[PDB]
Design a protein around this ligand. Structure first.
Ligand SMILES: CCCCCCCCCCCCCCCC(=O)O
Ligand SMILES: CCCCCCCCCCCCCCCC(=O)O
Ligand SMILES: [Fe+3]
Ligand SMILES: [Fe+3]
Ligand SMILES: [Mn+3]
Ligand SMILES: [Mn+3]
Lengths: 291, 291
């Protein structure tokens, strides 16, 4: 009762022109190893930051690494959904995606080790109601709903949560924050490289999510309503996450950052996700999903 | 009800000395891209083979690619089991493992495309009762049993099936067969490279499986009885798979292969798996699993 054929033995083999398999090939060509990045200069720069600056960097790094860990775990029901859909190229892509998230977890962990952020860091994520809502609750709920029901609507809700909010709104805003922190000051060249490489990977993750939502919208435009509903539900939580300040928080945010600017940037990113997905409305599904 | 902390934010971070994380690092250092292998000479060699030789090579290649596809899908419940055990380093490793199997599927598919094996090839696996029993039935049954019950005993049964039989008995015998086919004749240099690279990856897969079984045996030596029972159940099926001949089968196996020699080699590989796992009997678990 488990398997009756193999996609890889069908006539015509695997469709290398499919979006997931093109992304798989790009990810192989662009592979990078966290172990090759030297963090010694970052450790020196870390010592020159003020305490308030270290706290803000630790908070951003903690939000990132916990998020990379979360997606590493929470993507897995999508792999099983693609197995149920019979979509083996998408399943293959998701294996690379998931591994890439484990590798992102690794790289942040190595950076933290290098600068000495080796105590318990949960206070930087667990006290933020927006972060908790997304990464402790909404992300795993939406992705695990695919186990009992891998319907197009649930796939779109899961992809909006994972690819269009967690990645395509929050991670992108985080990369912008890192750029503001590091470029203004010429600090943390290792982290600058991390951000470049993880961002390269993220563009493929986001392309997969855009493809997933587009093909479902093309097949049944009711799924566009689902995309908008899920985004309207989640975006306020993402904005809350960005605007949160700890009890210990300085009146002046370090690095001359404007947290409300970050929130506005995030809203713009979310709008771009919606716009990309909206382009599939009225397109025949076979022109998006060659399969 | 889904997540309450993050392994990556705990004091002491991730334990890079753990076996799974050492393997993860090795896999990153040894990454290879299927797209970098030139199969043009293999295509020329393919044209010089007899029909009977092509049929035998197609059979071996089909058994491999379908097996790579099977493990790509069927490993995934182990990732969820490690999430349940709270074993995040093992989960990270399994993401690389799973991706590597997708990449093995890719490389065989590219080789098949290059030589022109692009029709339906199910006749080469679906008619073999040993192959069917393992790859259609026993592998997915044993691995999916971890969803409702990720107990040590079920983990050992799943790892014996996946790592010690599918990989550590059958794949290793298949690599030996490829070596016999290609080295005796100086043919298929692309496939020779494929076999070297996939074999390198397999040694890490098998090391993970050896570790998994060892730590469970060390914790509860009743799991040694489970290892032996599962191996005694599966090895006859693996031998049947190797000895199978199609209806169309020549009286003389091509390439001067002796199928019963391959079966004996497989039995020796299985014995080596058991011997490796048996070394954990009586070892305190903390000396295997530093965690
Ligand atoms: C100092 C103020 C910082 C404000 C916070 C900016 C938003 C950071 C969000 C990080 C979430 C990380 C998600 C990772 C997901 C992925 O890797 O695929
Ligand atoms: C011409 C006779 C050939 C005899 C068959 C030899 C055995 C081949 C078995 C191949 C199984 C492949 C399993 C792959 C698993 C993995 O990649 O992890
Ligand atoms: Fe991502
Ligand atoms: Fe393997
Ligand atoms: Mn990431
Ligand atoms: Mn393999």
């Amino acid at each position: 009762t488990f398997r009756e054929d193999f996609h890889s033995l069908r006539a015509g083999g695997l469709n290398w022109d499919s979006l997931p398999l093109r992304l798989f090939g790009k990810g192989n060509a662009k592979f990078w190893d966290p172990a090759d990045i030297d963090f010694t200069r970052d450790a020196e720069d870390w010592q020159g930051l003020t305490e308030e600056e270290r706290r803000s960097v630790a908070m951003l790094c903690s939000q990132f690494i916990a998020g990379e860990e979360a997606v590493t775990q929470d993507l897995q029901p999508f792999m099983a959904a693609m197995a149920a859909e019979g979509r083996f190229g998408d399943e293959m892509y998701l294996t690379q995606f998931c591994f890439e998230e484990a590798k992102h977890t690794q790289v942040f962990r190595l950076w933290m080790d290098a600068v000495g952020l080796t105590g318990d860091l949960h206070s930087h994520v667990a006290e933020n109601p927006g972060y908790r809502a997304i990464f402790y609750e909404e992300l795993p709920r939406s992705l695990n709903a695919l186990h009992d029901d891998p319907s197009p609507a649930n796939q779109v809700r899961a992809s909006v949560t994972y690819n269009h909010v967690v990645e395509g709104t929050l991670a992108l805003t985080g990369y912008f924050a890192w750029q503001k922190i590091c470029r203004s000051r010429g600090i943390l060249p290792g982290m600058q490289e991390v951000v470049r490489r993880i961002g390269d990977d993220e563009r493929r993750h986001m392309a997969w999510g855009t493809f997933t939502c587009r093909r479902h919208v093309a097949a049944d435009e009711s799924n566009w309503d689902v995309v908008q509903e899920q985004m309207q539900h989640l975006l306020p939580l993402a904005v809350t996450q960005i605007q949160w300040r700890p009890e210990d928080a300085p009146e002046e945010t370090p690095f001359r950052l404007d947290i409300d600017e970050l929130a506005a940037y995030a809203s713009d990113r979310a709008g771009r996700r919606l716009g990309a997905i909206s382009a599939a409305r009225g397109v025949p599904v076979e022109q998006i999903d060659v399969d």
